């Protein structure tokens, strides 16, 4: 695979040196869109672009999306500081799109977990937009010690039983220190027309976070990319699970 | 007894302060968990806890479950607002369990009317799930005045005779404005294995609302807490009554 | 949302202009066909079409099916008059199908009240076909004043108390003046093959009017779209409700 | 994380330099047991040993067992050649044991996929010992071109539709070129005595391969280590899965 | 017709050589898959394939399904042995499907006795699953001689009168030595939707063995192939017969 | 495997020597207790104990329960005689429980024939208690010769054709000489709560003898161990079999 601190620097180069098939730089100018009056919090990275410039890195994102994204997101944090003297901007998302292979929803499940994939389908329903605790800061009300606990949006709220410093159980969730974002679930499946006659269509549930919330309605034809997650479904004599797609990038199909 | 305002205070306290013998802030943690992405709509409260922390209040929810349960629900809403800055959060139920006495169905008398009881028995039947109007919003077709009327699932629907404001006798219940929850009847009785030979087992009908509907099938042995109600027999106009159990909490025995 | 006058415009547009990916003017062609010697009394509209052409309007018929369906039917009548010089043509239904979400019977909650839903399931029962008064014409025996009163098949008959004009309390429903259509109840439920072991299948009653009556027998598996209604349980005066599905479109699954 | 070619060399050092808390080398002599009249095909590596000598590597095995093992197995292949002039020995397994944390069976499922874990429980049943195609060699009967396809024991036999060289569909599985091993499933759960009164015990199914087949009978109390795998269970409207434990090392509890 | 030895040759060929219009070696691939860790115990053979590759043989399995089916099973066993060096592999069934003609239950006559037919209909009933002795091993209590006797699930058990070797009339069936498979009866009939008004639907009983037992529930519409049997009515000693369908292959219609 | 003489030795050992993790001589203590004024007629043996002490023997009682159970019962009789000088003591059963695998009723196949299995399920039915002849003493009316014939409760009564000694064909079963024990049938099945939706629960009939008769009523959930038997369906002369569970040990789940 590839060293983590190295991907960071390898992405910075992509972000800078790249220019498309007409000889025009592009990611320099996407980064500037982060500093308008109404900024964005996301940088859409074409993967065909990243592969034609750095094939060995592009195949590492897919193989390890969790690290691959986290890396590219540090490389954006840097380039904003080195090429634009900014360290005030805060969290920026790196959303990859236009991957090599496009799955139909039915083809997922056969697919492997924790790997970046691309799916095309139709949205059948979307949830209530609700606040998600993405970072929980617990506080000992006895000694004062703070404890940070990061959260996965596909697992319930994880907490801490006792204070790691003084051993006290008298802890509370500090809502102010903690970090919240928007959350919105949705469900896609394969469009009836792309299936055979007596073929039951299949579905998968997704998670949208922060700034890609409220991006879609039912009936929308879409192309999402994200990471599959295995989630508990029922704790039977032996547990069964399902697969949900934590979305990294979504756009409508044209 | 205790007035509402004060019960709510006493409850909000219990929730925040109570700790078990190990020092876990049980009810703080449960309320904390309502901030999870897919929360419960109930908070179960061990009566023995409430009793050890505020015995007068604990004995008060048995005597006046309707008040106590309501107070405890308002307390929860307060803690969510005050200690977690959560507002939009919906109704959260306070369900009490583990009362000091467990009755057999044959022991449930009309003296227990409108108090909280705890019964053990086996489910004989379970009704079909239907919607029930917890909150009926009526609307005048003339002035468009909106009158809110709460209902009880064991009493008949309470309509309005005439508009309270414009005086019009032309009001209907507005379905879109009103609030509904799931409803499901069920029946428990004493198992024959617990009775004298020859003894006819006694039963009682209950009601399950909202998030405890469809929690039991026939053949299940359960422990329920609930407010006993005695309602006039609809069957006739005679002075014979019918015991109904409005369930507050239900769990299966041995789990 | 959209006011009636404007929906009708937006609909008439859709009908005339919409074309599929191949360029066929689907709804023009269907309306054209109403000029055949033995026409249909309905025009089925693929929701996904309406959505791709006028998404705001499409999401509007789900939110307010009663309005949307009514608007679309007025639009059809317009196109027949304007583009085909056809007047006498009777009522033509607008039946929407292929909604984005398909519910199981067990998922149909009272939150869906008065919205359009799409359900899949198996027909358990089918009622006897009877006449229903879509339009009740009442007539005063004194002045001969005629009062028109529309009805809903899931509500009780709305009569008139007294003559609106001469004030007489002597009016009867005139059968010859009134309009009737076929009516037929039916029931669908989830197939056990789709539930957890031990799970009791849930069901729901529906209503078929006019030209979709007698379209299904028991055993059929179907997909219906319809406006969910929640009506007070006639069984009693209690606050318990009953879900009824007023079917807008029905087709068998897989065909 | 760590570079792959590097773990190899890092393991070779462990295998050589290590000596226990009494000052005696150990893995030098385990490797010689591979060259007796009746050799072994496995080297049991204590993890407490690997952690006390190379903490950063030991935590990488657990985090990436698939690579971590494959690495340590190359490092054994080497050390047999460099310190014992042998490249004839063939496939040797690296089986890690005595990990930091021991799960009860019930605690699995909550556990993460593709990570080395350790479980204690009791065997309730064991399967028929049967031959598993671990490496499938397909052959084009037209041009002659060979195609190698490696197999996962928790997924059905994977094949190839057509010849990658000449495009022909006239392919056959060459049983002689292909590689087979023993396979035997089994099932463990938590011992009734370590559970509460009205507590339904939970189970998990395991896979034993090659030389660790037939190692256990029902009733045996055991400590296995392995990698969890998510497997399809039923292709419902949305697919459900289960978790099975591909075993890396098994021994009875004393 | 064809003798057994030669059918097996012709079948082994078909399996190995057959390719579809795209060039896929269908039956090679299916047999290849029996080497997977959890294999099937059947190989389904499209009759239309066999027909296009060896028409005389194909028409032979309809005329003599018992022979053909047996030959095809021996062929499979050969290919596994010869081309995959697999021996221990158990019995593998050859199940034929997609025959040229599909009968309605009302068309199945006794002329079809002992031939292969293909029927479409709806499952009315499904029996309880029971064990059936495919291979009865008898054992003499005196000499310990072992006599193997195959059985048919539609005929009565064929015992042995006396030991074939030591002549002893003291033999019993040995259960441990014998082979059993699952058995399950079922019944199909024509759907009334396919008959004249007033017509009484006709039915027929079938048998499912081994790995096709418990494949259908009532209400399922299916297409089955099977050997028709006509057995004397056990009901009496009269000369009236009963049609039974010994199913070779079953799949649901429309899938 | 192990011959009878040697199993008995190995068993007698286990009984005497076995100790748990705390050092209690469990089976010594149980056998000691048979000297109490009102003893049991059974000694329950935890399989996991026998397995930890003599694994080969333990796996042997599963493979050959009839032998193993019989051997263990002879061992008990020995220990009572040798270590307690007790002779007159009647038959004492050896009932094994807590086997390594627990089957669902649907998993019990004829491969388990004549082995020991452990099943979990719910009692659907319980038969009437009747007497069964464990030991049939037949008596010749001419010479007065006595022939002992043991019986199995799942097979038909084995009589004697003619007197073994005087050759007379005139023998009857002597009731006073014979031994009887209580007999009771029962039936268990899988609970629907444990099956796929739509799945028909499977069941199995069992037999309780002597001191475990009348131990369960319908509705009880139980864990049984027993020797599976497959007996020919008496219903007919067909080759279809019937699974019957000859219960060795039964206890209710969770207690
Ligand atoms: Zn602290
Ligand atoms: Zn008013
Ligand atoms: Zn008038
Ligand atoms: Zn080739
Ligand atoms: Zn003989
Ligand atoms: Zn005699």
Numbering used by the authors:
A (entry chain H), D (entry chain H): 0 to 253
B (entry chain D), C (entry chain C), E (entry chain D), F (entry chain C): 0 to 254
Source paper text:
The Minichromosome Maintenance (MCM) complex forms an essential hexameric-ring helicase that unwinds DNA at the replication fork (1–3). MCM proteins have three conserved domains: an N-terminal domain (MCMN) that mediates the head-to-head interaction of the initial double-hexamer; a conserved AAA+ ATPase domain; and a short helix-turn-helix domain at the C-terminus. Crystal structures of the N-terminal domains of Methanobacterium thermautotrophicus (MtMCMN), Sulfolobus solfataricus (SsoMCMN) and Pyrococcus furiosis (PfMCMN) show a consistent hexameric ring structure with three subdomains: a helical subdomain-A, a Zn-binding subdomain-B and an OB-fold subdomain-C. The crystal structure of PfMCMN bound to single-stranded DNA (ssDNA) revealed that subdomain-C binds ssDNA in the plane of the hexameric ring via conserved residues defined as the MCM single-stranded DNA-binding motif (MSSB).
One mutant is a triple-mutant of the PfMCMN β-turn, K233A/R234A/K236A (PfMCMN-βT). The crystal structure of PfMCMN-βT consists of a central pentameric ring with five peripheral monomers. As in the PfMCMN-WT hexamer, adjacent subunits interact with each other via a short antiparallel β-sheet interaction: P130 carbonyl–F240 amide and V132 amide–P238 carbonyl. Intriguingly, two of the residues involved in this interaction, P238 and F240, are positioned just following the 3 alanine mutations on the β-turn, providing a straightforward basis for the different oligomeric form of PfMCMN-βT than the PfMCMN-WT hexamer. In particular, the carbonyl of P238 is notably shifted in PfMCMN-βT when compared to PfMCMN-WT. This shift is not compatible with retaining the specific P238-V132 interaction in a hexamer because the constituent atoms are separated by 4 Å when PfMCMN-βT monomers are superimposed on each subunit of the wild-type hexamer (data not shown). AUC sedimentation velocity and equilibrium experiments show that PfMCMN-βT most likely adopts a pentameric structure in solution. Analysis with an A5 ↔ 5A model (where A5 is pentamer and A is monomer) indicates that the protein concentration where 50% is pentameric and 50% is monomeric (Kd1–5 = 8 μM) is 7-fold lower than that of the PfMCMN-WT hexamer (Kd1–6 = 60 μM). The PfMCMN-βT mutant forms a pentameric ring that does not bind ssDNA. A pentamer, therefore, may not be able to attain the precise interface needed to bind ssDNA.
